[PDB]
Amino acid sequence: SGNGAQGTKFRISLGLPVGAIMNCADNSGARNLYIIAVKGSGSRLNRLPAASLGDMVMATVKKGKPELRKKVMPAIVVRQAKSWRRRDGVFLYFEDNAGVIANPKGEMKGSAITGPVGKECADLWPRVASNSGVVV
Amino acid sequence: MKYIQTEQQIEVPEGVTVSIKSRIVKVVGPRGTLTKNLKHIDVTFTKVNNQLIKVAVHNGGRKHVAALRTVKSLVDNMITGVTKGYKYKMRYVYAHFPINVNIVEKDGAKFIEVRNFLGDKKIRNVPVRDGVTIEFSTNVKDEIVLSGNSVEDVSQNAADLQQICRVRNKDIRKFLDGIYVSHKGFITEDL
Amino acid sequence: TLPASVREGINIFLDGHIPAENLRFRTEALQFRIADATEDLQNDSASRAFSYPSLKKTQGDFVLNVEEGEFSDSEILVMMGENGTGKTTLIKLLAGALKPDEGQDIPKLNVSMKPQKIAPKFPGTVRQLFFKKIRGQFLNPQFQTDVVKPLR
RNA sequence: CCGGACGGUGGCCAUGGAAGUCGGAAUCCGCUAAGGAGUGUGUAACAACUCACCGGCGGAGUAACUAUGACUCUCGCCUCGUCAUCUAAUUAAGUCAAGCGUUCAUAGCGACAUUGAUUGUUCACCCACUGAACUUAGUACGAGAGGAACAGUUC
Numbered sequence A: 001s002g003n004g005a006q007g008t009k010f011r012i013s014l015g016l017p018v019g020a021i022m023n024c025a026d027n028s029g030a031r032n033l034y035i036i037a038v039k040g041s042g043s044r045l046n047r048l049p050a051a052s053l054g055d056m057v058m059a060t061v062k063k064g065k066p067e068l069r070k071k072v073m074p075a076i077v078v079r080q081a082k083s084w085r086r087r088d089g090v091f092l093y094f095e096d097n098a099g100v101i102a103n104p105k106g107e108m109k110g111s112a113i114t115g116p117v118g119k120e121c122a123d124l125w126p127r128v129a130s131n132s133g134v135v136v
Numbered sequence B: 001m002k003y004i005q006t007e008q009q010i011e012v013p014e015g016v017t018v019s020i021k022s023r024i025v026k027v028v029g030p031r032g033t034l035t036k037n038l039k040h041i042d043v044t045f046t047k048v049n050n051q052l053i054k055v056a057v058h059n060g061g062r063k064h065v066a067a068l069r070t071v072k073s074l075v076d077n078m079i080t081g082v083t084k085g086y087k088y089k090m091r092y093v094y095a096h097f098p099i100n101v102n103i104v105e106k107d108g109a110k111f112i113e114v115r116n117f118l119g120d121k122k123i124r125n126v127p128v129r130d131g132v133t134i135e136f137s138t139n140v141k142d143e144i145v146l147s148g149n150s151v152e153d154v155s156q157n158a159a160d161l162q163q164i165c166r167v168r169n170k171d172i173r174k175f176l177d178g179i180y181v182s183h184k185g186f187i188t189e190d191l
Numbered sequence C: 001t002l003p004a005s006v007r008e009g010i011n012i013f014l015d016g017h018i019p020a021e022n023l024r025f026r027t028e029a030l031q032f033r034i035a036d037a038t039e040d041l042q043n044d045s046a047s048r049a050f051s052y053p054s055l056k057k058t059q060g061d062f063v064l065n066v067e068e069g070e071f072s073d074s075e076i077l078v079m080m081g082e083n084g085t086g087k088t089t090l091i092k093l094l095a096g097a098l099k100p101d102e103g104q105d106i107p108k109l110n111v112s113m114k115p116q117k118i119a120p121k122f123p124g125t126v127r128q129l130f131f132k133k134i135r136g137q138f139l140n141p142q143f144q145t146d147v148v149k150p151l152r
Numbered sequence D: 001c002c003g004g005a006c007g008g009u010g011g012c013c014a015u016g017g018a019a020g021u022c023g024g025a026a027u028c029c030g031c032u033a034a035g036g037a038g039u040g041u042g043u044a045a046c047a048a049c050u051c052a053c054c055g056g057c058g059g060a061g062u063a064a065c066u067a068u069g070a071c072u073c074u075c076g077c078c079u080c081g082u083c084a085u086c087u088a089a090u091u092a093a094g095u096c097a098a099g100c101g102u103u104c105a106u107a108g109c110g111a112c113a114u115u116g117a118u119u120g121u122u123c124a125c126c127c128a129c130u131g132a133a134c135u136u137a138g139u140a141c142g143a144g145a146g147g148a149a150c151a152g153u154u155c
Helices: A125-130 B062-083 B151-163 C006-015 C087-097 C126-133 C141-151
Strands: A022-023 A032-039 A058-059 A074-078 A098-101 B005-009 B017-021 B024-030 B032-039 B044-048 B051-058 B085-095 B101-103 B109-113 B122-127 B133-138 B143-148 B180-184 C055-058 C063-066
Touching: A022 A074, A058 A098, A125 C006, B005 B062, B017 B062, B024 B062, B032 B044, B032 B062, B051 B062, B062 B151, B122 B151, B143 B151, B151 B180, C055 C087, C063 C087
Parallel strands: A022 A098
Antiparallel strands: A022 A032, A032 A058, A058 A074, A074 A098, B005 B051, B017 B024, B024 B032, B044 B051, B085 B143, B085 B180, B101 B109, B109 B122, B133 B143, C055 C063
16 A cells, blocks of 8 residues: 555555465556565564555566566556455455556556456545446 | 741732631632632731731841742732732734634533634634633734733733743744733723 | 547546546546535534624616525635626625625624625735735745645 | 043054054054053954943885786785675774864864774674654755754654
């Protein structure tokens, strides 16, 4: 979360600790995203920081265009897999872990998002809304 | 070095009688009446004549004697407040946000209610003390006026209001918003 | 710009930015208060403001009817509807410019009024006119932002 | 508490401009009760304040370039090395006050003197995060540059 995130976010189950790799779901040239940090996460001895739906992470691209590899950039988690629970009572989950590469302000690097996108992320990051097909 | 006696005069004027037992002062005049307790001090009051009353300290140090003038003054301002009375004026001060000031009442209350102070989302209230009345001066812009018989209650009621409008987290020399005391005087005019 | 769709063109307009051109055409984005955003106060002031009774104003060709309503302090009321409805007539009556055929509204209040159609009928220059009304309002920073600097 | 604080003249040289008030000495005169060739505040530069002082109150030489050294002559510690490469990432109290602080000793300082990788690693060095976000508000202040909070809301 943080910059450019207009909205607050209700807690959702943390799915992705540091080291996790999600699918890159944009058209940027990136094939996956390797999580090295979660923004706005706190501190407890021994705890991995771990992201969830609509969290902004800091990632590198393990697989993808060489102009994207070997460096750290912001991304946003768009699909989960660890099931979480909404305030309408529902426990839900996607089939994959996936997020999209983005700028500190929260602008997509790419122009499409392939696959669905959870609403809690859509609601959080307007330029993600824009590029989303099926939401939730 | 201990001064064998030092004394002071408290002059008494035509409309008032002041009566003292133990060290309890009752001053009564045209404007009503005021009483104050001087037990915490150790001075000796003595009447010379309906228009004169002395106060004296025997064998006192610096600090004791220092307290003797301040007894004179304290009882003076009781006497003047019961004749001329006291009136403090304050004015609102703001660069952008017009400070709106009312008088509300919850349960026999009387409070001075300050809205909008610097845009401030909170509604400020200062209770009106007893013995003190409040007029928003006609003919003058953003002037509040506190009056009554007791300088101490008027003065403090005033300072309660000014202090309820201190600014936080701003350069207080650029952000001069406030309600400041602007004139200290009397209720009866000519004097 | 190049031709666009109806929905699309409107959406881009409201952003205040156009990508190909890469210009932020409008300095600040337009937003409307949620009503969650507004300040929460107990409103009355002196217990409520003034109130008007039923009013009627009849020209002899048009008739206006008004239902008794109440106004409170520190509030804002919108008036909507089509022209020729007597939206203008109503405001005038409250201004005291017009006398009601029936009903009365004699308030103690001091009123400032701005007319709908503005045609000049004042001799004098623009600065002189505004200074007579009030100087000091001209000093405020708010007025610099909205009037003075934009138009010049 | 308050009134008065004056003429030679804006002394003289240094003077870019120094008219009392950065500076070099020199301290006179008239005035009248008393008013310094001038205590501090000085616009560049007078003013305009003020105050004193009257008063009211083993080692070296060598260069048609620096360096090196073909030539002549003589008896892996430092290290976490540097470049790459693999990583998002890689040991894989205080006093004195001369001074600064452009004007000013003490705002801020003060000489002299004196009372998650990598590693066993601690450490160290990076990579990230974050009390924060949201409106309050791109607001108040500011020529702009920029930039608040108290209230309310969610974590």
